[PDB]
Subunit: 346 residues, 4 copies
């Protein structure tokens, strides 16, 4: 089969031909219908050799949707042809966190050699992919695969981040979304669907601010030195109940600390190495909590899919072939994909 792989440190990923895998016991083989590109893949490919630990070659793609092609020995609960989304952050399944479906916060996975697809195990940017266990598949019915693939991370991650503090976001609350890309543009729509928060979007790029308004942001503010004052102006001096920072640069985290309300929340979701919130007296308001959330839970993925099926998430995508995979990653690096890049194998 055709796949897109990261094959040597510092180089662009390449289109390859590798064997179509066969499922062992408990496993499922999917025919991939859509594979999302996430900016996390760029963080991974930019790691120096000393930091990089996922093995070479590596089939990319941690956002995967497909149809069941072959059942491994013992597998029931899915039929051949079933449309499924892949739950990404694989855990041990047995610990206290995993028993609640919170496999994103499993502490045993590393020691057991469990790695996620596209980030240690073979990903979804290929004609076919293996899934380790039935509990890591979620049915999607007749959902369009292209709009469905991003739900598995661009949807799941903001959904989880928002869910951690959803009781704060009552009528009268304000939520700030910093970064209107793959994650951010879905985050705005989740906020609108599950809360009565007023949503203020923040981005460097005017066209992303337009995207923000298109998907339901109440206001849009230019990022940078003026953002904090502009946000406070909109919130009448009380600040924002919650800030969801999908950039996570030091400048955006600083903006978040300068606008968050007393007894509010900052969720540092975007990854920028070295950047951090400074949580201490006189540097942040009383009662304003800060966290770096990771991925999401099994039941949260089901909820994201339910939002999509109810028509609550308009996922903005651009489609690419497998051959266009390396080019699509260049587009993501330069910031020219309006929403989520998705590879459709054929």
């Amino acid at each position: 089969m055709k796949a897109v792989q990261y094959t040597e440190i510092g180089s662009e990923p390449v289109v390859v031909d590798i064997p179509t895998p066969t499922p062992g016991p408990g496993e499922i083989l999917l025919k991939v219908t859509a594979a999302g590109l996430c900016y996390s893949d760029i963080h991974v490919m930019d790691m120096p050799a000393a930091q990089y630990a996922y093995g070479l070659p590596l089939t990319l793609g941690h956002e995967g949707v497909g149809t069941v092609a072959e059942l491994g020995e013992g597998v029931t609960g899915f039929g051949v042809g079933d449309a499924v989304a892949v739950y990404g952050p694989w855990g041990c399944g047995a610990c206290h966190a995993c028993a609640r479906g919170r496999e994103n916060y499993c502490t045993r996975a590393a020691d057991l050699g469990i790695t996620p697809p596209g980030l240690g195990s073979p990903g979804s940017m290929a004609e076919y992919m293996i899934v380790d266990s039935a509990r890591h598949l979620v049915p999607i019915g007749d959902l369009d695969p292209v709009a469905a693939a991003p739900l598995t991370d661009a949807g799941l991650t903001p959904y989880h981040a928002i869910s951690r503090v959803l009781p704060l976001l009552g009528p009268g609350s304000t939520a700030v979304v910093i970064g209107v890309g793959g994650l951010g543009h879905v985050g705005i729509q989740i906020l609108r669907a599950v809360s009565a928060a007023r949503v203020i979007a923040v981005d460097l790029d005017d066209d992303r601010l337009a995207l923000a308004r298109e998907v339901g942001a109440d206001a849009a503010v230019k990022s940078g030195a003026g953002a904090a004052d502009a946000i406070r102006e909109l919130t009448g001096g009380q600040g924002a109940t919650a800030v969801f920072d999908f950039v996570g640069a030091q400048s955006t985290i600083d903006t978040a600390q300068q606008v968050v309300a007393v007894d509010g929340h900052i969720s540092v979701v975007g990854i920028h190495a070295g950047a951090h919130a400074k949580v201490g007296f006189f540097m942040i308001p009383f009662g304003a909590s800060v966290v770096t959330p990771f991925a999401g839970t099994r039941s949260e993925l089901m909820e994201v899919v339910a939002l999509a099926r109810a028509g609550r998430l308009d996922i903005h995508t651009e489609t690419f072939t497998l051959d266009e995979g390396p080019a699509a990653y260049r587009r993501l690096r330069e910031g020219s994909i309006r929403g989520r890049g998705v590879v459709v194998p054929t």
Copy 2:
């Protein structure tokens, strides 16, 4: 009446004679039965002239218990002689936070000129004190006033901090308490009363570690460079579900970050100017939230009092006269009060 006041910047507080106040409409005059000394009073007295904003002179004492002496015009809900604790963090009473009793997180108080007793308004270290409103008194019944006075901050503040994350502290959880002084020694006992968490206490002083074990800590370990490794040894490498840092120095916050579990919590309660947690990817575990909580809520103070009345809180105190007030503050500076210093007026 006799009172202890901070009268000039940089100097020790002094015993003074000032008029016994009379309550205006809505106010209550208390005969003070006990007034706690909090290390926050030392932070206040160590502020340079440029930072200090509470006015001079200032009657100290933000931990107050008394008996109702005189009702101001229009006051109902209390009779002369009723034993009451003073709710410290006065708010506007009208905003969304105050409507839930969360006057500790009121955003309107500053602009309305509302200041707390002992920290802008006259405190409890005097024979008598004014309380602005009936809603800032809580009945204590026959509770010993000396052990009751610390409940209003040494009790309330750890109670609130713990309450923010109480659902995390189920059976199998571990809570670390850093700093076994006024706040910390009460915090250990709250954890034992309201959760099934295993409690690990941390302090510089071996006698405070003994205090920790006396009030129910399951383990007590020496603070400093070795503390993080010793705590991890006790938690089997998973780390601590929650860390309540009642010191809040950079070294203790660093210890907290090095031991906190995935999806855990650090509560930075102690105040050490410039110290802060660094909340960013690779600097803290995924899902570990951090906050600087402040004081507590009206209903939380009632719950603290209920714990005391049920025999769940053994409050360690040393008693001082009003004349010994300045000496008691020197004792607090040097770290020689085993628990909470309390002034009893006579």
Copy 3:
């Protein structure tokens, strides 16, 4: 001033002339801009003499909005002219429930002689009204008073009921609303604003089903013997995550028990004497909780007002003068007010 009062047991309320009150210390006098009619007023007026305990005469109206006219001695936090809504379920202000703003669940109010406006103390169906304390006023800014008055109960009560189980109502959930009247039509809109629940409305009247669809219900079905099967058909046999019964008759509670999901909720909000859910093994699904909620909290009223100010609540009203007050109550009895009746002085 002119007021509408219940004056003798069994009779219709009457328009009267009574003195304009003056505020004592701590009190506020409002010029009333809008006063809602609630079907609870009909329950009260239909009480026999033995049951009725609110005193005669009684100025009706537990849904009140006004402008501050006079401050009593010592009152701060409001200026003359401020537009305010009245928080209805007055409590002692001092107990553990009241300290959290949950004065709707205060246990001390009765013994202290605290009664709510329109239900023991003088209500809002008058040119002016007294409010006991500043904490029982909530600012409404430039909100239209006519659409604002129902927020104080038609809004507050469903808001509280929904709020008790809001964490159940995630994406993929279903909420059933039984009774699309004053309360129900606002409840549909609250569900849409604060949850991703799919909303199924139930009513006897086809025009109320149309109202339900107008304010955002995803489906609207006829009440009665066929309702339970029709709801199950819509939910694919799993049933409804939550049922908010704003009728509360035995037949509607039975429908609720026949459709509620495992680990779901029934909120019995409407009042029908003797009617009750039967909560026991084999009579209801495992984990399905049932409650009769009452009114709402201080912070909940603020949230309802915030929803109204954000344009999330389209409150359907019909306006009446004080003189038309008795006629408006006849209209409410016969079921001919499409939404909430409101009296404007």
Copy 4:
């Protein structure tokens, strides 16, 4: 092997000899170390032929602990010899409830033919037993199996019931426990470990009231016509925050409704056919919720085991051999087991 089976409708269970089973793929064979008797087994054996639906013969025992004897094909996560408790309420593992570990509330199990051990599938009252999947085992380490077996239902069920409303049970709260038998005597101890509630126990039998005090009840009241007034006397007229009714007869549910506080809770846990709470205006206080909970969740079972391992649960048992199984069930019927009956195979 030797087993205790229900073999014909209306008759006592009998000791039998049946083949030692072999595990299919995904299954685990346990050597049973302890098997609890639950009063639910008596409800089942008292069902008329028309109602009874679990098949004949049926190996009894839905409270099971053992050691792993043989792994079925593909099973990982356990070694031969590991001491484990059996999670009883088996679900499909795939639905939204099961994804959160809430297999007790799975809606798909019936249609998929999934039945629990001792209640449709073969139970633990035998030398060996099959478990369907690894996710239905929980490690117990060196816990005494005899005291561990009741944790799987006598522990789990009260734990879940209490957990549903744990945020109500703050300092100052009161919890009533009706019925101090297998479940009730563990329920008292859970309340003491995870809350600061004052605990009032209610039973018909004075010796069970003594048991209640032995395991930490603050007060003990005789059940019957006087119970409601005696409970109100103890709660000062406000009533009980929560009532956990482990009898569930109409008389005990009536007592519960007559004592529950405004904004409180009644949990109807015990099963008595036809008995029900009457939830309507003027028949129950405002805001007092009522529910019939069922069993518990995967993570809750882990928490119960963690309580046992921390020394928080003193489980009162009487031990029986397999041959004494039928006699033990007669003892349970007549109410002469002081706590939980447990069968130890040899």
